[PDB]
């Protein structure tokens, strides 16, 4: 139920494939999806979740660098997939920027994204 | 054991008084302690912690505005006090800045501070 295209509330598109081994691979891009806005993503998920109605734990990372741009930062999303008619992936994320030692204290932003199968 | 002066690794000084009711009141200042860098702090703590060797849960807030400066932001520290010869307050914090709707996604920084009774 994870493989496919997902959309968040900020206008980003998450295209992912869930391997049978627990691997997550794909791309993260803007609403449009032009070449310069596409970034590689890799992650892992629980390929054998509980059957008590619990969600499926997962996480992935995107380093904000491609063959055109580099924001010297990386974001990791940690959350869980909830299946159903209105399936979604609820996450909390950490965005860390490369900084000097003096600015290390303010190197990480925290937030949350909800992804859905419909825009 | 909480009342007193505390120091973090960044060079900040935390002066606090722990009330019998569970209130925390004090000031957060720079190493130098000049008036322009002194801010009011208020918080709460567990006034009746467990006796199984567990730490004492606590938290406080500092809005970064005083009678001299205003950084339009506020930080909350959440953690626990651990007593002993080398007492410490281990925390994780959230720094939120006032932002426009468009910048709300990057309004909050996350980090961690360890406070000790010795510099």
């Amino acid at each position: 139920g994870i493989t496919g295209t997902w959309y968040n509330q900020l206008g980003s598109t998450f295209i992912v494939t869930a391997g049978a081994d627990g691997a997550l691979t794909g791309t993260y891009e803007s609403a449009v999806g032009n070449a310069e806005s596409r970034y590689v993503l890799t992650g892992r998920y629980d390929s054998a979740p509980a059957t008590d109605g619990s969600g499926t734990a997962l996480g992935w990372t995107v380093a904000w660098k491609n063959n055109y741009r580099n924001a010297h930062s990386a974001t990791t999303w940690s959350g869980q997939y909830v299946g159903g008619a209105e399936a979604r992936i609820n996450t909390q994320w950490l965005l860390t920027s490369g900084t000097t030692e003096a600015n290390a204290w303010k190197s990480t932003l925290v937030g949350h994204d909800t992804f859905t199968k419909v825009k | 054991g909480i009342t007193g002066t505390w120091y973090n690794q960044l060079g900040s000084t935390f002066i606090v008084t722990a009330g019998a009711d569970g209130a925390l009141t004090g000031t957060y200042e720079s190493a130098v302690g000049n008036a322009e860098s002194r801010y009011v702090l208020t918080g709460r703590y567990d006034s009746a912690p467990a006796t199984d060797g567990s730490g004492t849960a606590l938290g406080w807030t500092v809005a970064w505005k005083n009678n001299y400066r205003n950084a339009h932001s506020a930080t909350t520290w959440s953690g626990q006090y651990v007593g002993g010869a080398e007492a410490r307050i281990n925390t994780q914090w959230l720094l939120t800045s006032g932002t426009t709707e468009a910048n709300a996604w990057k309004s909050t920084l996350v980090g961690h501070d360890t406070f000790t009774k010795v510099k």
Binding site: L10, G11, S12, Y28, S30, A31, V32, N34, E36, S37, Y39, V62, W64, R69, A71, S73, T75, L95 | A102, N103, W105, K106
Partner: peptide
């Protein structure tokens, strides 16, 4: 407004 890939930036700033 958005100048970072995370907030869905399309064009460079």
């Amino acid at each position: 407004r958005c100048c970072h890939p995370q907030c869905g930036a399309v064009e460079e700033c």
